[PDB]
Amino acid sequence: RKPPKGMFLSQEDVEAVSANATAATTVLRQLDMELVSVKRQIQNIKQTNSALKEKLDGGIEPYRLPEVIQKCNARWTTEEQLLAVQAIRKYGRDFQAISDVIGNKSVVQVKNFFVNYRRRFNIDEVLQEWEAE
Amino acid sequence: PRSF
Amino acid sequence: PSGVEGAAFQSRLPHDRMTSQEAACFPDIISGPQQTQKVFLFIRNRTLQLWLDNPKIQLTFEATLQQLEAPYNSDTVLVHRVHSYLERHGLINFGIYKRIKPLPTKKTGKVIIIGSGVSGLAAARQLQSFGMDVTLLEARDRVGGRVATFRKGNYVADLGAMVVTGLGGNPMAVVSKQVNMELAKIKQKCPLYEANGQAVPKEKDEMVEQEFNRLLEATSYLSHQLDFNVLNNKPVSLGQALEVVIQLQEKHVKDEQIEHWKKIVKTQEELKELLNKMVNLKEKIKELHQQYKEASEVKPPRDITAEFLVKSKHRDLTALCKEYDELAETQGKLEEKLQELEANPPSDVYLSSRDRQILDWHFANLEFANATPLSTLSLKHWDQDDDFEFTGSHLTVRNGYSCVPVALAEGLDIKLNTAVRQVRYTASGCEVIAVNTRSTSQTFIYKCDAVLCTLPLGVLKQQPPAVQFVPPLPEWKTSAVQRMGFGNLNKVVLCFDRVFWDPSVNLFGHVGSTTASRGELFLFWNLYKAPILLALVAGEAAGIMENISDDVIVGRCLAILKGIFGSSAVPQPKETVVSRWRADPWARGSYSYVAAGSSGNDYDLMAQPITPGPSIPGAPQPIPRLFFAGEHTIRNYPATVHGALLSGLREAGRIADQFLGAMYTL
Secondary structure, eight states: OOOOTTOOOOHHHHHHHHSSTTHHHHHHHHHHHHHHHHHHHHHHHHHHHHHHHHHTTTTTTTTOOOOOOOOOOOSOOHHHHHHHHHHHHHHSSOHHHHHHHHOSSOHHHHHHHHHHTTTTTTHHHHHHHHHTO | OOOO | OOTHHHHHHTTTOOTTSOOHHHHHHOHHHHTSOHHHHHHHHHHHHHHHHHHHHOTTBOOOHHHHHHHOOTTTTSOHHHHHHHHHHHHHTTSSSOSSOBOSSOOOSSOOSEEEEEOOBHHHHHHHHHHHHTTOEEEEEOSSSSSBTTOOOEEETTEEEOSSOOEEOOSBTOTHHHHHHHTTOOEEEOOOOOOEEOTTSOBOOHHHHHHHHHHHHHHHHHHHHHHHTTOOOEETTEEOBHHHHHHHHHHHHHHHHHHHHHHHHHHHHHHHHHHHHHHHHHHHHHHHHHHHHHHHHHHHHSOSSOOHHHHHHHHHHHHHHHHHHHHHHHHHHHHHHHHHHHHHHHHSOOOSOSOOHHHHHHHHHHHHHHHHHTTSOTTTBBTTTTTTTGGGOOBSOOEEETTOTTHHHHHHTTTSOEEOSEEEEEEEEETTEEEEEEEESSSTTOEEEEEESEEEEOOOHHHHHOSSOSSEEESOOOHHHHHHHHHSEEOOOEEEEEEOSSOOSOTTOSEEEEOOSSSTTTTTTOEEEOOSSSSEEEEEEOHHHHHHHTTSOHHHHHHHHHHHHHHHHHHHHOOOOSEEEEOOTTTOTTTSSSOEEOBTTOOHHHHHHHHOOBOOOOSSTTSOOOOOOEEEOSGGGOTTSTTSHHHHHHHHHHHHHHHHHHHTOOOSOO
C-alpha cells in the first residue's frame, strides 16, 4: 500500500523521469541549477542585510529620553486644560497620547473631560478641524 | 532468491 | 513442524488440503465427504513420514499397511492407491535405497534420456525402478552436468552448484541421509573490503545494506502498486526500476534542499523589510529628537503652545522609540530563526561515490543470485519463486557435490562421450542420432518409445542448433525458449599451501571500483578443509572474463588478496581452475532466470511434452513421445539442483503413467 518510509515515489514523479532517455538528468539539473540560484539570492540579501545592519549601529540610545515618574492628579489646572485642547486638535481621539501629553491625567479622566468641558472649549469644532488633516 |  | 504434519511440509505438501495433483488421481475423494478426505490426508502424511524416517530402504505397500492403525488400516485399496500414487510421483522410494522387492528381469518400454545431469539421473533411476529400459546419452566424459567438482590430490572444489538451500522441505535432505554428504553450515558474516583493501567500517556497511534492501522493496512497490511494468512498449527490468528509484531518491534530496534554503530566503527577506522599517524609524527619531531639543532650548517661561510643543514632541519621541524597540525585539526572533535554519540543513547527497560503490557490491550479489545483469531480469516476476524457499541455514558440500550424481548414476546404462545430434519422434516411436565426441565420425542410432530431454536451456537456445528436432519443435515451445533467460556466472578456484585468511569467516567481499566491473571477483569463499579459496565472477563481468586468459584472471585475484592481507601473506597458488560456462558447449550458460518479457508461465510451457502428428492421416491422435526435464522446466524451483531433481522425478512419473499405465485412478 505505501512505499518504505524515506523512499519517495510519486506516480506523477515517476513519469516525469521516465518520459525521455535523459529525462532524469534534465529534471536533476533543472533542480541543481535552481538550487544554486537560490543560494546566490541568499548571499545577495545577506550582503544587503549586512549593510542595513550597519546603519543601525548605536541603535537609538543617544535619542532615547528618560521616563517620568508622575502620580496621576485629579484637578484640571488652567494650564492642563490648555494642553488638552491643543492635544485634541493634534491627535483626534488617541486618549492614550493625550494622557501622555498632559501626563498627570488618566485616559478615563481625559475621556470624561471631553464631555464635561465639551460645550465650552468648543471641542466639537476642534475635532472637525482635526479631521481636515 | 537474493541468497542473502 | 513435527509429527505427520512435518512429513507433509518436508514433502512440500499442505498437510490439511489435497493438492491439484491428488484431486486428479483421486477425484472420488476430493469430491466426496470431508471425513474421507481427512482419512486420505492422514494416510498420505503417514506414508510420507514412514519413508522420511528411514529413506535408506524401500517402503513396500505391505510395510506401509502394517504400521498403519485403525480406522486407517481398514480400506486397504485406499492405502494401496495412496502408496502407489506416492511411489509413482517420487514422493517416496526415490533416490538411492535398498530394494526389498528386486526389479523384474523383464523390462517394459524403452526410454532414451538425453543428459546425465541430476534431472536426467533422477528420472532414469526412477524409470528403471518402475521396470522400464532406460539408457542415458551423455556428451561429456562424466555425469553431473552443472554439478562439476574439481579433484586433484586433497584439493576439492565445486565449479558448479555448491550450496544446498536449506533442508526445510528440500528433497536433497533425503539424498543426504542416503549418501554420505558432508553438509557444512555457512556463517553469514561477510566483511566487505574496498578497492584499496581496507575493511569497510561497520556503520557504513549496515546503512548501505539497509538501503539496498529498502531499494529492492521500493521496486516491488513500483511493480505491484503503481503497475510500472511497461515502458515504451518494452517490459521493465529490475535494473531499470532500480535506476528510476535511485533517481527519484536523488531527486528527493535535491527537492528537500531547495525547500529548506528557499525557507531561509523567506525569512531573510522579511528580515530585509524589517530593517528598512528600522532604518527609517531611526531617521525619524534622529529628526524628532532634534526638534525636541530645539523646542526644549526655548527657556521658560513659555506660552502654552510652546509648552505644548515640548510635551508633544516628547510624547511622539517616546512613541516612535517604543515602536523601534519592538522591531529590535522582533528582529532578534528572526535572527534566531536564521541561526537555527542554517544549523539544521538536510543531507546534501542521497549517495556519493564511496557509498554507491558499496551499493554496487550488493547489486553484484543479486546479479550472482540470478546469474544475470539486473537489466535483463523481469521486474514483475524475477522473484516469483520466493514463496517456496526452504527453511534452515544454507549448506555447502565439503566432500564435493559430485558425490551426488556419481552416486545416483550407479546401476544405470550411461553412454559417455555420446553427443546427441538429432531427435526424431514419430507416431510409432523415436530414434535419437548421436556421435562420439572423441571422434565425430562414429555414428550411433538409438530407437525407443520415448525421449526425455534434459538438454540445458542454453543448448536449446543455440543458433545454429546443436540439436535438431525432427519434426521441429512447435512455435509455442520454441518461443518459450527464446523468451526465457539463461544466465551466466563463473568461478575461480584458488589452491594454496597455507591458510592466510580468517578461518572463522566462510566468505568475504571485494568492492569493485566501477559499476561496470561490480561483478569482477566481487566475492570469495572459504568452504573446504584444504586451503582453497573460491572467487565469483558475476553480472556483466561473467561473460567478459571469458575472453581473458586464466593467468591474467588469477593475477587479478592475487592483486585483490594482496590488497587485503599484504603482499607478504599471499603465496603463488599451487593449483588454479577457472570456469567458462557460457563457452561450455554442453551448458552454454549457468542457469535460468526470469527474463524481462518472460514469466514463470514459460517454465510450465517448457515442461509440456510433445505429441507427434499421426503417421497415416486419419489415424487416431497418438501418445506424447518427447518429454522435458531439468532446471528450466520446474516453475516453482528453477535454477537449482533440487529443482532439477524434482523435474526428473516428475517426468519419470509422467512417462510411466503414459507407458506403464496408471492403475491408481479407479
